[PDB]
Design a protein around this ligand. Sequence first.
Ligand SMILES: Cc1cn([C@H]2C[C@H](OP(=O)(O)O)[C@@H](COP(=O)(O)O)O2)c(=O)[nH]c1=O
Length: 129
Amino acid sequence: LHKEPATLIKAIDGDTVKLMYKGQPMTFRLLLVDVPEFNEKYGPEASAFTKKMVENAKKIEVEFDKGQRTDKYGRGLAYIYADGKMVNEALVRQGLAKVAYVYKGNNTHEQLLRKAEAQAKKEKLNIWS
Ligand SMILES: Cc1cn([C@H]2C[C@H](OP(=O)(O)O)[C@@H](COP(=O)(O)O)O2)c(=O)[nH]c1=O
């Protein structure tokens, strides 16, 4: 896979962010994760976590997987990086997201994220507390 440039337009919530990609505004949905809803336990903490990671980043990058690049809502499907750190992975490592929505052909980082989830669960972090 390849990292491509983007710039933050604005934080939205734990697993969606609005970025400028190839000069066009897009909502991106983070591949391979599910964050709780804002009104569910750890929803607000997941939003806050993603917000801080993307807002504090000097360099945002988008990495598409090998399959579908947009979902049925027109959201971009990607791995998002903040100064070389994957937001998708970081959410799961902190117990603020579950590995989820693992579709065949867009699952390159599945084992990386499952390892993060196993570490978060072992540490009883957040959703695993
Ligand atoms: C993460 C992801 C979500 N989706 C769709 C499936 C879900 O459909 P439904 O809306 O019909 O439930 C929805 C979940 O996203 P959210 O968790 O943002 O709601 O997004 C994909 O099609 N591909 C994906 O990779």
